[PDB]
Design a protein around this ligand. Structure first.
Ligand code: HEM
Ligand code: HEM
Lengths: 451, 452
């Protein structure tokens, strides 16, 4: 098995002590090919980049989801919510079976009006800018995604478009996430220099718990029904066990939806806008469809489904820069990968999604080009070639939500504005637990079509 | 011989006005001493008038003209020779007055109505989107509304106050400049080194205001675009005599002036009206009934606002009790005798104590402290010069029709869309700056769930 340079006891870990480790790992995959071992003190994984090997890794009879160290640190505040649970934990399957119907394509009809509410706020914000002003794209997309998941998730208004400083919940959550990510690159975590970090982390957990627990207790005392995930979780019983989720787990799911959904979806929107700005022919076609389809003052659910080319633009953005760029698996039993590489029970694999998505044997030689027409016939894409939403029963439960949100909002953005890159921005991909184009800014020129 | 409260050696009457609520203190002195009293401080002197009898003489423009109070003189450092801080004799006063009058008529409000609705909808949506425990800071939100409305109607510029915690830098500088000008009134040793930073900041703030407004004027002139705003009217309007428009510098001073003169007075009014409606359930029910009956469309039309008669009366009664620009100052143009009793010399100052005028029991009856909008039901029955919240004559508020159209629209919409409750049992605290407002007034709104 190929492997990058080791540095004594540190092994390969110094190669990930960099602001952009996924990008560095893509460069290693370029050098070493479809599979390479990566060792850190007390752990080992194997990074996979080819569809050939990844299709085996996605065999659920042979491999199951592993909790990466990142996910283990996020569990300190996401608990046994869906994303940070082992498949064999009772609350994983229970929450999965209760929630799956609230996340179907059908269920998006019920969330659509709340998604529209926030999308209109975003458009109105941009319509109201003066000639001298510009848009901070990822910052505004994140205000939108957070507010949308707040409203659809538990009928709560963070009111991000009314503030300079976010709602305290948002500040704590973002800072909690940031700390969990920082712990991955922290060699002496019990050194006194991290006492303040630990104190702040605990304060932030309490801020998130107190708000979400209060909203759950308020809802239960009032008896009111809403079109939100909270109502579904309070009323739902798991078909298998016959049991509903307990209040603590419900809190963890709410926190989980916010964490799992906000930056991934924000990143996607930002990357799509960036690529449209770089590809005028693609832009013209997307904007033509938006104008033809979105004939009403606000989009209907059905109209969003008819934005086919906008959908293709978003898939092509996820091809190039899948915003949750890696997931981790373990071997359920001893097995041989690719007819060549023996693995033992418990051995870890890591899927490098951006590298999968550039497999020339699948996509052709033009893998760096932005061409949404690649997705024109989706039944022609081989199985396990395109995995921005992970795999199998542990795939993104929020896939339909994300894509409905992104299509709606991108359609509306294209219908209402022309966008200019006033700065000749050079793409800078910031890595947190997700990917986004840092510092991406534009100016909008309104088409003056009312809402 | 003129009443005067007790004097204390060189300090004169100044030890009796040791307060940041001088208008309220002066009302108590008027209660004791009556319709007219002299008030001396070291190095100044004026005569406070409280009766309609005397104030009607003071409002004789052949005998008295507007005086620039010390407050107005400090405001002139950044409002320049705009309308509010000019002497009636300054060439730019008469020139600007004649150019701008048609842009402020009742008829002209038809052209501003859509922009006023735009900001009013943003206010209503902000309140609709609050979570249940949240509350409203009334004067703060009313000021966001009035500032943004004058920005949009004045020079088609969006301060976007409902998108922010910290205001647009222009607003921050303007508010801080106003605050400094007010602070100078109570400053002994103004050239002490401890005020160097104040002076530096004041100059920075003037530059911030001038640079933005000058830029917007130059942008407008380069683009050639016409708008429904005061800036378009000032660029095109010509003085009949000279054939000239206002120059670019004066246009800037008028823009700064509209913001200063209009924002807090109108915001105060709205805030006082809401406060009084909360204290008078009978009156509230009647106002809200009219709002529901009149405002039958998803947004108000201009004609509907004109039909909000009782809402208009509520606002006039709020201006009766707490006129938000509470004083104006006059000087004697020539030697003259006031009220057949009090000789005045050329240049002598009078100050109209408007809240005290508005409590003249010989005019309004004994119930002057009650909030009764029905007092205004037949406005032809109110004696001349009895009700002056917008000042007097040619130097009266040019923005009167604007203010009242704004306030009526917004109060109608507020009553249509929400019930309000005072979750704190707030005690009225009337802060005095250049204007009056109910400081700290907070409420919770319960939506009626009527869409926009
Ligand atoms: C473009 C947007 C998004 C992308 C790219 C994305 C990607 C992913 C990926 C790759 C996984 C699997 C992770 C693993 O195997 O360890 C996942 C899981 C998950 N995602 Fe997303 N996601 C997106 C949006 C959302 C949204 C909007 C929500 C919720 C509203 C959400 C909720 C979840 C949840 C709950 C899981 C865990 C599911 C389970 O294991 O049962 N995601 N997502
Ligand atoms: C309830 C709201 C308002 C009240 C109570 C009010 C009151 C007054 C008063 C009492 C004066 C005379 C000051 C003096 O004699 O020294 C005045 C002048 C003025 N007001 Fe207002 N005002 C209001 C709203 C506005 C608005 C909205 C604007 C502009 C859009 C405005 C612009 C002016 C101007 C330019 C003057 C100076 C007029 C001149 O001397 O030629 N006011 N106002």
């Amino acid at each position: 098995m190929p492997q990058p340079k080791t540095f004594g006891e540190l092994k390969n870990l110094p190669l990930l002590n960099t602001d952009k480790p996924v990008q560095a790992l893509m460069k290693i995959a370029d050098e070493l090919g479809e599979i390479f071992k990566f060792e850190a003190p007390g752990r080992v994984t194997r990074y996979l980049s080819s569809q050939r090997l990844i299709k085996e890794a996605c065999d659920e009879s042979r491999f199951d989801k592993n909790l990466s160290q990142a996910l283990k640190f996020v569990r300190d505040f996401a608990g046994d919510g869906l994303a940070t649970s082992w498949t064999h934990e009772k609350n994983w399957k229970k929450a999965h079976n209760i929630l799956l119907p609230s996340f179907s394509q059908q269920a998006m009809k019920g969330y659509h009006a709340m998604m529209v509410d926030i999308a209109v706020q975003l458009v109105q914000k941009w319509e109201r800018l003066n000639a001298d002003e510009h848009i901070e794209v990822p910052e505004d997309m994140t205000r939108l995604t957070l507010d949308t998941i707040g409203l659809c998730g538990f009928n709560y208004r963070f009111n991000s478009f009314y503030r300079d400083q976010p709602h305290p919940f948002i500040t704590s959550m973002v800072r909690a996430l940031d700390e969990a990510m920082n712990k991955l690159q922290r060699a002496n975590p019990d050194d006194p220099a991290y006492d303040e970090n630990k104190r702040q982390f605990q304060e932030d957990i309490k801020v998130m718990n107190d708000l979400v627990d209060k909203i759950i207790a308020d809802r239960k005392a009032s008896g009111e029904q809403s079109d939100d995930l909270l109502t579904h979780m309070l009323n739902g019983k798991d078909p298998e066990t016959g049991e509903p989720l307990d209040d603590e787990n419900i809190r963890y799911q709410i926190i989980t939806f916010l964490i799992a959904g906000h930056e991934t979806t924000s990143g996607l929107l930002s990357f799509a806008l960036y690529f449209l700005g770089k590809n005028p022919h693609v832009l013209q076609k997307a904007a033509e469809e938006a104008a033809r389809v979105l004939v009403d003052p606000v989009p209907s659910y059905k109209q969003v489904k008819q934005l086919k080319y906008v959908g293709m633009v978003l898939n092509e953005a996820l091809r190039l820069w899948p915003t949750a760029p890696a997931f981790s698996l373990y071997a359920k039993e001893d097995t041989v990968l690719g007819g060549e590489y023996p693995l033992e029970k418990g051995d870890e694999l890591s899927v490098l999604i951006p590298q999968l998505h550039r497999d020339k044997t699948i996509w052709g030689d033009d893998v760096e080009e932005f061409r949404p027409e690649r997705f024109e016939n989706p039944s022609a894409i081989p199985q396990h070639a395109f995995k921005p939403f992970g795999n199998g029963q542990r795939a993104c439960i929020g896939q339909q939500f994300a894509l409905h949100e992104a299509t709606l909002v991108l359609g509306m953005m294209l219908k209402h504005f022309d966008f200019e890159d006033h700065t000749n921005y050079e793409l800078d991909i910031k890595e947190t637990l997700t990917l986004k184009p840092e510092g991406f800014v534009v100016k909008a020129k309104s088409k003056k079509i009312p809402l």
